[PDB]
Amino acid sequence: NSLALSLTADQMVSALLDAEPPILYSEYDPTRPFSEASMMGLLTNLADRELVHMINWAKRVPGFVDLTLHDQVHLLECAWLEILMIGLVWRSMEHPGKLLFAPNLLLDRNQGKCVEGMVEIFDMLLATSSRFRMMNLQGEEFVCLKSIILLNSGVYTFKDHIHRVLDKITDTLIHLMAKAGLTLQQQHQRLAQLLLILSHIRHMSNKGMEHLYSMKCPLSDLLLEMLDAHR
Amino acid sequence: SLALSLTADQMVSALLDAEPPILYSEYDPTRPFSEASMMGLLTNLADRELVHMINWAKRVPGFVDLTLHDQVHLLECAWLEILMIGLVWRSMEHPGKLLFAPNLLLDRNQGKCVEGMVEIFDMLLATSSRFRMMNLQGEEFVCLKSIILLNSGVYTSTLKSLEEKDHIHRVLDKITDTLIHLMAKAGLTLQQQHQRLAQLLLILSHIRHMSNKGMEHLYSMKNVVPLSDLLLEMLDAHRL
Amino acid sequence: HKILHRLLQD
Amino acid sequence: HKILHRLLQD
């Protein structure tokens, strides 16, 4: 019982694709450049709005609905910045050297010098985006990786159902690579490469989180509660 | 390079042979426990393990091919991860216990005496429990530990040469091949092979998490408790 | 309690 | 210059 485990590989792909959250816009003020306040203002505002859509996306991730409410809360509180980051990184792929936070908010590493810790977090995000770009990450792979983050990042802090679903998503990934014409060796090599990048995404989240609840001295009440979960 | 010319069997034997020993702690069962002494025991242990780790890294295929600064960088990034997965591996057949040393076995209750320790302990216990349920093999463990060394620091020619990054990834691909070889050798089906491969690499994310959280608390008490010079420098690396 | 909850319910 | 550096160097 779950429905997710009964899905086929293509059913899994379409379901995840259809669940994809929209790309939101930042505020349309062309005033340049930014202060430390306005820069963090724009990003925080954006992140807070994205979170509302992330939570509806999560409910549509196969297997997530079968979890108890508190298990859903735990996984989201654990992985929210990871999920935002892999989204940002995916968005920025076609823009080498830049971070596409929103279609009207494309930033480079230089525009972050006005904030402590920003250049460092920017460079890592940029490195990740460049990595995805060199691997030619496909959208169908991206949605698999993102759902994996949701289910995996907090699973060790509770589980069998989640691992069964994680197994299903693995099957789906391999199915995608075989469909693309990759040899068997190429398939497991690519799987590994993709999953290992998730370790770095965790790192970026932890490092970013650490700064966030240090300078948390205006965050939305929701963002504060998500942030408070890591403290 | 030699790392790319090694078969899967040769990769395993090389990694197995390079395994560091299991060290003892200075644990005195007569001495009254204290927060400062418990952390002292763990710090002293880690500092001695670090020396073996550094010479272990040199024996990891492909690692010696890298420039010295890259070697330094990879170890500065991965040292706590490598210590932790080692601890977790030693603790597998000790349910609810962490085997820091043969004379230092600990449960989560003995961790409440320092702020932040019980949280790390629970995460480490959960990882060993995961390994125990998965029935992790030694040949798989040594592959995982060397993946961490080469992977954890690689995303941080040229202006910081990209040729090195490619060599590391080639070696990483070889270790992936080695993991798959082991799994097929164990009679697993293709579906089971890539599933177990995924399960293994996903645990590395949690190991990263434990290291990040552990590091965070570690450079907060740097609050009296004596760190060794090497440990102090490794810890400084996660700041600037 | 938490804003997350409500967002998850509806 | 760096303990790890020296140790890696021997």
Ligand SMILES: CC(=C(c1ccc(O)cc1)c1ccc(O)cc1)c1ccc(C(C)(C)C)cc1
């Ligand atoms: C890149 C990033 C964020 C962010 C998240 C929450 C905030 O309150 C502010 C920024 C982000 C990630 C993805 C996304 O779609 C939108 C926003 C971030 C940037 C800088 C930092 C500091 C280290 C400077 C605090 C932290 C997170």
Ligand SMILES: CC(=C(c1ccc(O)cc1)c1ccc(O)cc1)c1ccc(C(C)(C)C)cc1
């Ligand atoms: C589990 C762990 C450590 C450790 C590392 C460095 C130290 O100075 C002290 C302890 C460890 C890991 C593996 C190993 O083989 C030996 C030691 C650790 C325990 C507690 C903490 C705090 C959060 C309490 C700071 C950090 C790391």
